[PDB]
RNA sequence: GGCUGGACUCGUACUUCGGUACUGGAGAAACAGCC
């Protein structure tokens, strides 16, 4: 059933656009909340953004708006960092809210991105 | 816009002691708080949802209470695997206050 | 205005719960509407909760 | 978890008074099943 696996994590110079992908498998639901959460190494969890799968509805934090673009493909969900900076260097998890009640039940293992 | 202030940053306890973590919401989130546990090297996992309700596959020693904007995670009997960082999450993606995480807590058992 | 984007999300939630097939036994469609009412009840709780955030108190 | 609907007991309306249609009518958020 429910499983999420993300990829794309690299090391890139600043200003180098970067696409992370979450492949989502085993979901019986039409729509659900697909969230992107960020953690800098040694530091805490930071909610990047979220999308509602079936619709075109994307939402972001005040600090992330316009620097990140979440897109939805039939099996895929992409997080695009359009202008990374060295403070964007972190691990990125995708999380899933199946109940649409706001809590993250299912996480991916995460990916690691470095910016230098 | 939403800001979760997680009051205790670090708490150490001898086994069998009660730890009380508190989150303060910058706005009324009602039932929209959820508590998460993360251990080094691995993604987090659900502990509490809708602020009082224990998640599946979780030991029952975890408690939580909404009171207004003050929310509490209370662990009574502590154990060793309780060494981990804990976060509170609050809000909803489509709410005018977008979902926000607390600063985090570190729990190490002596 | 993100209240608008929220409302479009809501409409997309109410439309994810399509009406039942009108053709069928009288109590077959009683059960169809019975299960449809639960889903519409969750959607109503969620959407009312969201809409309160932009209007509310 | 996802889907399905069956015997009844009633409540309305109109009945050539035996019957019918009705779930923004009720028992039924029951009950019984299928994947």
TrEMBL record, chain C:
Region (Disordered): 14-40
Domain of life: Viruses
Region annotated Homomultimerization, chain positions: 9-17
Motif Nuclear localization signal and RNA-binding (RRE), residue numbers: 25-41
PTM section of the record: Phosphorylated by protein kinase CK2. Presence of, and maybe binding to the N-terminus of the regulatory beta subunit of CK2 is necessary for CK2-mediated Rev's phosphorylation.
Ranges annotated as biased composition (Basic residues): 27-38
Subcellular location(s) of the protein: Host cytoplasm; Host nucleus, Host nucleolus
Domain comment in the entry: The RNA-binding motif binds to the RRE, a 240 bp stem-and-loop structure present in incompletely spliced viral pre-mRNAs. This region also contains the NLS which mediates nuclear localization via KPNB1 binding and, when the N-terminal sequence is present, nucleolar targeting. These overlapping functions prevent Rev bound to RRE from undesirable return to the nucleus. When Rev binds the RRE, the NLS becomes masked while the NES remains accessible. The leucine-rich NES mediates binding to human XPO1.
Function: Escorts unspliced or incompletely spliced viral pre-mRNAs (late transcripts) out of the nucleus of infected cells. These pre-mRNAs carry a recognition sequence called Rev responsive element (RRE) located in the env gene, that is not present in fully spliced viral mRNAs (early transcripts). This function is essential since most viral proteins are translated from unspliced or partially spliced pre-mRNAs which cannot exit the nucleus by the pathway used by fully processed cellular mRNAs. Rev itself is translated from a fully spliced mRNA that readily exits the nucleus.
UniProt similarity note: Belongs to the HIV-1 REV protein family.
Note: HIV-1 lineages are divided in three main groups, M (for Major), O (for Outlier), and N (for New, or Non-M, Non-O). The vast majority of strains found worldwide belong to the group M. Group O seems to be endemic to and largely confined to Cameroon and neighboring countries in West Central Africa, where these viruses represent a small minority of HIV-1 strains. The group N is represented by a limited number of isolates from Cameroonian persons. The group M is further subdivided in 9 clades or subtypes (A to D, F to H, J and K).
Self-association state and partner proteins as the record states: Homomultimer; when bound to the RRE. Multimeric assembly is essential for activity and may involve XPO1. Binds to human KPNB1, XPO1, TNPO1, RANBP5 and IPO7. Interacts with the viral Integrase. Interacts with human KHDRBS1. Interacts with human NAP1; this interaction decreases Rev multimerization and stimulates its activity. Interacts with human DEAD-box helicases DDX3 and DDX24; these interactions may serve for viral RNA export to the cytoplasm and packaging, respectively.
Protein name per its UniProtKB record: Protein Rev
Gene name of the record: rev
Region of the whole protein represented: 10 to 66 of 116
């Amino acid at each position: 059933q429910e499983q999420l696996v993300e990829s794309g994590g690299r090391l890139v110079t600043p200003g180098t656009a970067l696409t992370l992908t979450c492949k989502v498998s085993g979901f019986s639901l039409s729509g659900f909340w697909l969230n992107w959460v960020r953690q800098a190494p040694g530091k805490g969890l930071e909610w990047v953004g979220a999308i509602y799968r079936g619709s075109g509805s994307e939402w972001y934090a005040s600090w992330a708006k316009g620097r990140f673009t979440i897109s939805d493909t039939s099996t895929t969900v992409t997080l695009k960092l359009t202008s990374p900076t060295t403070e964007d260097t972190a691990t990125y998890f995708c999380a899933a809210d199946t109940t649409d009640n706001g809590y993250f039940t299912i996480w991916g293992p995460g990916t690691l991105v470095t910016v230098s | 816009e939403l800001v979760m202030t997680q009051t205790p940053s670090s708490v150490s306890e001898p086994v069998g002691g009660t730890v009380t973590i508190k989150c303060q919401a910058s706005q009324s989130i009602s039932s929209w708080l959820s508590w998460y546990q993360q251990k080094p090297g691995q993604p987090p996992k659900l502990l509490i949802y809708d602020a009082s309700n224990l998640a599946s596959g979780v030991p029952s020693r975890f408690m939580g209470s909404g009171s207004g904007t003050e929310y509490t995670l209370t662990i009574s009997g502590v154990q060793r695997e309780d060494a981990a960082t804990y976060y509170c999450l609050g809000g909803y993606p489509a709410a005018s206050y977008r979902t926000a995480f607390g600063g985090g807590t570190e729990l190490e058992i002596i | 205005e993100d209240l608008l984007k929220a409302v479009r999300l809501i409409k997309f939630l109410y439309q994810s719960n399509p009406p039942p097939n009108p053709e069928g036994t009288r109590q077959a469609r009683r059960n169809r509407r019975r299960r449809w009412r639960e889903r519409q009840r969750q959607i109503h709780s969620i959407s009312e909760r969201i809409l309160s955030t932009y209007l509310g108190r």
